[PDB]
Design an enzyme around this catalytic site. Structure first.
Site, PDB file in Angstrom:
ATOM      1  N   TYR A  72      -7.707   3.693  -9.415  1.00 16.10           N
ATOM      2  CA  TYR A  72      -7.134   4.246  -8.185  1.00 16.10           C
ATOM      3  C   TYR A  72      -8.186   5.238  -7.712  1.00 16.10           C
ATOM      4  CZ  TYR A  72      -2.451   2.587  -9.453  1.00 16.10           C
ATOM      5  OH  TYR A  72      -1.420   1.767  -9.787  1.00 16.10           O
ATOM      6  N   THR A  73      -8.398   5.275  -6.395  1.00 17.83           N
ATOM      7  CA  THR A  73      -9.368   6.176  -5.772  1.00 17.83           C
ATOM      8  C   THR A  73      -8.581   7.208  -4.956  1.00 17.83           C
ATOM      9  OG1 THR A  73     -10.815   4.266  -5.591  1.00 17.83           O
ATOM     10  CG2 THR A  73     -11.491   6.224  -4.472  1.00 17.83           C
ATOM     11  N   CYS A 108     -13.641  -4.726  -0.596  1.00 14.00           N
ATOM     12  CA  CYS A 108     -12.614  -4.486  -1.593  1.00 14.00           C
ATOM     13  C   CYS A 108     -11.274  -5.033  -1.099  1.00 14.00           C
ATOM     14  CB  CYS A 108     -12.501  -2.999  -1.899  1.00 14.00           C
ATOM     15  SG  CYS A 108     -11.380  -2.659  -3.252  1.00 14.00           S
ATOM     16  N   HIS A 123     -14.542   5.793  -9.409  1.00 14.06           N
ATOM     17  CA  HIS A 123     -13.086   5.903  -9.454  1.00 14.06           C
ATOM     18  C   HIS A 123     -12.484   6.481 -10.741  1.00 14.06           C
ATOM     19  CE1 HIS A 123     -13.623   1.514 -10.709  1.00 14.06           C
ATOM     20  NE2 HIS A 123     -12.762   1.904 -11.633  1.00 14.06           N
TER      21      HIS A 123
HETATM   22  C1  LIG Z   1     -11.562   0.612  -6.579  1.00 13.01           C
HETATM   23  C2  LIG Z   1     -10.032   0.435  -6.560  1.00 13.01           C
HETATM   24  C3  LIG Z   1      -9.230   1.307  -5.878  1.00 13.01           C
HETATM   25  C4  LIG Z   1      -7.914   1.150  -5.846  1.00 13.01           C
HETATM   26  N1  LIG Z   1      -7.213   2.074  -5.232  1.00 13.01           N
HETATM   27  C5  LIG Z   1      -5.903   1.885  -5.023  1.00 13.01           C
HETATM   28  C6  LIG Z   1      -5.219   2.892  -4.279  1.00 13.01           C
HETATM   29  O1  LIG Z   1      -5.672   3.907  -3.800  1.00 13.01           O
HETATM   30  N2  LIG Z   1      -3.876   2.668  -4.061  1.00 13.01           N
HETATM   31  C7  LIG Z   1      -3.168   1.615  -4.414  1.00 13.01           C
HETATM   32  O2  LIG Z   1      -2.004   1.581  -4.097  1.00 13.01           O
HETATM   33  N3  LIG Z   1      -3.963   0.688  -5.078  1.00 13.01           N
HETATM   34  C8  LIG Z   1      -5.283   0.764  -5.493  1.00 13.01           C
HETATM   35  N4  LIG Z   1      -5.997  -0.050  -6.299  1.00 13.01           N
HETATM   36  C9  LIG Z   1      -5.320  -1.015  -6.955  1.00 13.01           C
HETATM   37  C10 LIG Z   1      -5.039  -1.179  -8.542  1.00 13.01           C
HETATM   38  O3  LIG Z   1      -6.158  -1.660  -9.396  1.00 13.01           O
HETATM   39  C11 LIG Z   1      -3.765  -2.140  -8.959  1.00 13.01           C
HETATM   40  O4  LIG Z   1      -4.028  -3.513  -9.471  1.00 13.01           O
HETATM   41  C12 LIG Z   1      -2.489  -1.950  -8.129  1.00 13.01           C
HETATM   42  O5  LIG Z   1      -2.330  -0.585  -7.812  1.00 13.01           O
HETATM   43  C13 LIG Z   1      -1.209  -2.117  -8.810  1.00 13.01           C
HETATM   44  O6  LIG Z   1      -1.133  -3.235  -9.635  1.00 13.01           O
HETATM   45  P1  LIG Z   1       0.054  -2.932 -10.698  1.00 13.01           P
HETATM   46  O7  LIG Z   1      -0.703  -2.084 -11.587  1.00 13.01           O
HETATM   47  O8  LIG Z   1       1.295  -2.363 -10.066  1.00 13.01           O
HETATM   48  O9  LIG Z   1       0.317  -4.303 -11.550  1.00 13.01           O
HETATM   49  P2  LIG Z   1       0.112  -5.862 -11.311  1.00 13.01           P
HETATM   50  O10 LIG Z   1       1.419  -6.582 -11.168  1.00 13.01           O
HETATM   51  O11 LIG Z   1      -0.906  -6.286 -12.319  1.00 13.01           O
HETATM   52  O12 LIG Z   1      -0.559  -6.107  -9.868  1.00 13.01           O
HETATM   53  C14 LIG Z   1      -1.535  -7.163  -9.558  1.00 13.01           C
HETATM   54  C15 LIG Z   1      -1.055  -8.612  -9.342  1.00 13.01           C
HETATM   55  O13 LIG Z   1       0.368  -8.912  -9.150  1.00 13.01           O
HETATM   56  C16 LIG Z   1       0.613  -9.081  -7.737  1.00 13.01           C
HETATM   57  N5  LIG Z   1       1.896  -8.536  -7.258  1.00 13.01           N
HETATM   58  C17 LIG Z   1       2.947  -8.192  -8.016  1.00 13.01           C
HETATM   59  N6  LIG Z   1       4.008  -7.908  -7.252  1.00 13.01           N
HETATM   60  C18 LIG Z   1       3.580  -8.134  -6.040  1.00 13.01           C
HETATM   61  C19 LIG Z   1       4.349  -8.004  -4.956  1.00 13.01           C
HETATM   62  N7  LIG Z   1       5.652  -7.766  -5.014  1.00 13.01           N
HETATM   63  N8  LIG Z   1       3.732  -8.201  -3.779  1.00 13.01           N
HETATM   64  C20 LIG Z   1       2.448  -8.578  -3.712  1.00 13.01           C
HETATM   65  N9  LIG Z   1       1.726  -8.738  -4.826  1.00 13.01           N
HETATM   66  C21 LIG Z   1       2.299  -8.498  -6.007  1.00 13.01           C
HETATM   67  C22 LIG Z   1      -0.613  -8.497  -7.114  1.00 13.01           C
HETATM   68  O14 LIG Z   1      -0.759  -8.776  -5.738  1.00 13.01           O
HETATM   69  C23 LIG Z   1      -1.587  -9.178  -8.073  1.00 13.01           C
HETATM   70  O15 LIG Z   1      -1.480 -10.641  -8.240  1.00 13.01           O
HETATM   71  C24 LIG Z   1      -7.328   0.086  -6.470  1.00 13.01           C
HETATM   72  C25 LIG Z   1      -8.145  -0.787  -7.145  1.00 13.01           C
HETATM   73  C26 LIG Z   1      -9.474  -0.633  -7.222  1.00 13.01           C
HETATM   74  C27 LIG Z   1     -10.318  -1.566  -8.063  1.00 13.01           C
END
Ligand SMILES: Cc1cc2nc3c(=O)[nH]c(=O)nc-3n(C[C@H](O)[C@H](O)[C@H](O)COP(=O)(O)OP(=O)(O)OC[C@H]3O[C@@H](n4cnc5c(N)ncnc54)[C@H](O)[C@@H]3O)c2cc1C
Ligand SMILES: Nc1ncnc2c1ncn2[C@@H]1O[C@H](COP(=O)(O)OP(=O)(O)O)[C@@H](O)[C@H]1O
Length: 260
Positions: free
Chosen positions: A54-55, A232, A38
């Site tokens: 993000y992938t 995942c 990724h």
């Molecule tokens: C291999 C891999 C691939 C991924 N690919 C993608 C991708 O293609 N597209 C994509 O969209 N994401 C993807 N992600 C996800 C990514 O790592 C994030 O954690 C996510 O995109 C956004 O978190 P944030 O950065 O906005 O912040 P953060 O707020 O840190 O998000 C994480 C935490 O807060 C929660 N959270 C906050 N607000 C809400 C809400 N309103 N509703 C529900 N939960 C909430 C989360 O559910 C969790 O507890 C990928 C992750 C991995 C490991």
């Protein structure tokens, strides 16, 4: 190492999912991301520079750009997480033209060809592939799911997917999956599990609820030799919704269980 990308275009597929179209510092190249790995979209917000994996969902050979399918975490939307996601609202906050700067390739699983994996170092192989993801953890799968089809038909890897969500309108890559599902049934089993059902006036036949042993039993290859499981989804989903059961299906819970 970094690379300077630039949001050349963006699309609002619905009330909270966007298709971001980036462009690479050079038109003659591809993202070149290795299947199984990724990229980190870095950014400094507030004061802290925070990495987020993000992938991309683009065909590995798109020249000059890469797409990011993102589900925006809005504040004022959830009781437990009242302040949205950190890197998503910032991304929904970028006007088309802005530069972003990624950095890959991270990760530890790589589909080196045909069944041939390499996890945490070890080369491997399998014919029955068990896939389980919810919400956004599907992109890590889709890249693979897209790669075997593009190896048609010498790639005989059977892939069995269980894709969890909260509602029908929240099933991410769906047309694409229901398209392939038809094309290559000899190798891709697709099953939707959903928390609710907005309008059954239509007729939802797939499962309703959480992922559980029954679902796993009647949907995921018997945990045997040459059968690897990849998953995942949110930490909880894995912790007690996916982890124990795959034991209950006799998988070598120690070397056949990889997680992105
Ligand atoms: C291999 C891999 C691939 C991924 N690919 C993608 C991708 O293609 N597209 C994509 O969209 N994401 C993807 N992600 C996800 C990514 O790592 C994030 O954690 C996510 O995109 C956004 O978190 P944030 O950065 O906005 O912040 P953060 O707020 O840190 O998000 C994480 C935490 O807060 C929660 N959270 C906050 N607000 C809400 C809400 N309103 N509703 C529900 N939960 C909430 C989360 O559910 C969790 O507890 C990928 C992750 C991995 C490991
Ligand atoms: N305790 C849990 N047990 C089983 N599966 C879980 C659990 N918690 C969450 N999940 C599943 O994974 C999905 C959650 O995905 P996530 O990336 O959090 O975004 P969202 O919450 O918007 O779906 C849910 O639809 C649910 O099916």
């Amino acid at each position: 190492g970094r690379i300077h990308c630039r949001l050349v275009a963006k699309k609002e597929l619905s009330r909270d999912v966007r298709l971001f179209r980036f462009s690479l510092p050079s038109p003659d190249q591809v993202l070149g991301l290795p299947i199984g790995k990724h990229i980190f979209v870095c950014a400094t917000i507030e004061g802290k520079l925070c990495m987020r994996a993000y992938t991309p969902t683009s065909m590995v050979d798109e020249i000059g750009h890469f797409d990011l399918l993102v589900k925006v975490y809005f504040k004022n939307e959830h009781p437990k997480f009242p302040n949205g996601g950190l890197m998503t609202q910032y991304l929904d906050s970028l006007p088309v033209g802005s530069y972003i700067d990624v950095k890959g390739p991270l990760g530890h699983v790589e589909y080196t060809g045909r069944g041939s994996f390499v996890i945490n170092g070890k080369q491997r192989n399998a014919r029955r592939l068990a896939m389980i993801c919810g919400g956004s953890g599907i992109t890590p799968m889709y890249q693979i799911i897209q790669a075997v089809l593009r190896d048609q038909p010498e790639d005989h890897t059977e892939m069995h997917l269980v894709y969890a969500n909260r509602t029908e309108d929240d099933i991410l890559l769906r047309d694409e999956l229901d398209r392939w599902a038809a094309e290559y049934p000899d190798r891709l089993k697709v099953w939707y599990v959903i928390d609710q059902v907005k309008r059954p006036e239509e007729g939802w036949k797939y499962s309703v609820g959480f992922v559980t042993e029954a679902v796993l039993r009647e949907h995921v290859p018997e945990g045997g030799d040459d059968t690897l499981a990849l998953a995942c989804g949110p930490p909880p989903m894995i912790q007690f919704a996916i982890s124990p059961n795959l034991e209950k299906m006799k998988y070598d819970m120690a070397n056949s269980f990889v997680v992105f």
